[model samples]
Target: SFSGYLKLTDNVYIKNADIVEEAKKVKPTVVVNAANVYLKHGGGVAGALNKATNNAMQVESDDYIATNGPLKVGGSCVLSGHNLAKHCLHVVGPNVNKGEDIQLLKSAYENFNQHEVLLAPLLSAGIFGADPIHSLRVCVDTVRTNVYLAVFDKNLYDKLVSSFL
Candidate 1:
């Protein structure tokens, strides 16, 4: 469920909700995934997207990773050809179990380099384990588009409401 909305700029807004649900609502031109270095859409938002596009996302994801090589924390790969949207940006964010690499998170968000409207998961916050608020802040700062943050975690939802909203 969507918990809150914060207007960050004339063009940018911060939204808190399940990313898959939000994607369904907006049908954004671009959706981003905080994926693994290998670009396997196996879990979290990646898995949801895989199912959403009937595994079409999986094929391009694999090919993108293969062509781009292992994404070393800060790198990303762009995939398209799925019928659902114009593009899907896959980025490898910081894995908190290893280290809270915020720089890597910012780099991944920066991969899009600004677009019309981009929907993104709370980078590095799920299995990756980075701080939710920190992750959101970085995403909001990096993305200049009308960004929607599909936040599934209760803590992240609360932080988005109390701190940003």
Candidate 2:
């Protein structure tokens, strides 16, 4: 039903459904989680995936933060020592309270795009409270990877689909 509005471009896909379900369908080589410096996947998409992987994300994210320093907004830290996907790129995005953290969001997407192919959600738009369309544009424009925009809601997903139409 929702598939009618799907849009595709140069390896980018705009899906109007569950992020995790789309990711599962695509089976992407990597999944970039909109994470924070805390390294705790307590909520959001990250929380779901972290739980799916049995806290493997948490352990590796914590280890990464512990080894390096807390990732500042717009900063990215790679996750290791776990079988979480082929690779896991964790980025600290602005929270809902911070609002419209474009610089950090762009940088995080830029960092993750270093990989050839991956899946990422609209960063900083959910718990971070940034505008979804604006955030999606930033991610699509910045990252060079064959990426997926795994949107959670039909509103945000349809909004992206209409733009490309």
Candidate 3:
């Protein structure tokens, strides 16, 4: 049997899309991802894949935040930093597709909106947890959703708690 995560503690932490603000609040040190980020300054060339072929993992419906997507990935090798998400979620999923991610990600949000999930690596995993910013950036760089995160920040630890416990 799989003694998976705690039903009382597995959260996909949610937050508003304030990259700079959250970075300051969380105080991360680095960022990385597998995108061709050639702005005026930085970029990520690749990221890590959990290295499983022809496989699929399933969890209880309660454990999943149902969203819609044809999520995608490249030969990537991302790291932690101040650009991972819209600062909304801390879980993993495919990059949002252009023209249709906002609604989908929001739908994913609906999966956990009314729960008491624990967030913050400093608490859950320690101050060493990867920052959500890089994940937000990965989402931004990968997906182009018109529905930018205007208001975010709902704890996800509680939602995952059922799944974790």
For residues 1-165, what per-residue lDDT tens digits would candidate 1 score against the true structure? 223666665645566577777776666788888788877778888888788889888787777666777777877766772654577777778887876566787887777565667777777878787877787678767876666666776666766768863
* TM-score per model over all chains: 0.82, 0.83, 0.23
Please provide, for model 2 over 1-165, each residue's C-alpha lDDT reduced to its tens digit, 9 standing for 90 to 100: 123224466656666656566555555567788787777888888887787777877887777767887878887776641344566778777775855456666776777667887767888877777888777777768876677667888776777767753
Report the Cα lDDT for candidate 1: 0.72
lDDT of 1 at 91: 72
The global C-alpha lDDT for each of the candidates, from Candidate 1 onward, is 0.72, 0.71, 0.25
Predicted structure 3, TM vs. truth: 0.23
The TM-score, computed over Cα atoms with residue i paired to residue i, of candidate 2 is 0.83
The clash count of every prediction, one per candidate, is 0, 4, 32
The Cα RMSD in angstroms, rounded to one decimal, for candidate 1 relative to the true structure is 3.0
Best by the TM-score measure: 2
Query: Which residue ranges in model 3 land beyond 4 Å of their true spot?
Result: 1-9, 29-34, 37-73, 78-165
Identify the runs in model 2 with alpha carbons over 4 angstroms from their true place: 1-5, 80-84
Best by lDDT: 1
Measured over all alpha carbons after superposition, the RMSD of each candidate to the real structure, in angstroms, is: 3.0, 3.3, 16.4
